[PDB]
Design a binder for these strands. Structure first.
Ligand code: NA
Ligand code: NA
Length: 93
DNA sequence: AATAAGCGGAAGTGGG
DNA sequence: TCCCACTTCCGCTTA
């Protein structure tokens, strides 16, 4: 199954949920979620995964937190804002 | 308070 | 066996 960071990168590429997530500085890999519309995107992640429970933004962000140590996604010091690693961005493209 | 978000340990589930 | 890659639940903290 697809990994969370790849699900997010693919959404940013397609623009299919542009009201829920957007690039801040695409060259640096920084992106941000919508305060009001992030839950719809979290719901989509859970359905893509076939998880037992309904996915929430909180649970999705809890999963994102685990990428901080390995480096795929880091939290930026701004609400709802994250940054993909250069490895993630280059391999995706 | 109400609302929202952040922090993150610990235990549970998936598919190797 | 035992790690992967999260998921789920909980309690605390900050704005
Ligand atoms: Na445990
Ligand atoms: Na605030």
């Amino acid at each position: 199954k697809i990994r969370l960071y790849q699900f997010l990168l693919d959404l940013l590429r397609s623009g299919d949920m542009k009201d829920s997530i957007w690039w801040v500085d695409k060259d640096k890999g920084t992106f941000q979620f919508s305060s009001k519309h992030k839950e719809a995107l979290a719901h989509r992640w859970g359905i893509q995964k076939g998880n037992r429970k309904k996915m929430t933004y909180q649970k999705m962000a809890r999963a994102l937190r685990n990428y901080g140590k390995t480096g795929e996604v880091k939290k930026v010091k701004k609400k709802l804002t994250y940054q993909f690693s250069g490895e993630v961005l280059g391999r995706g493209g």
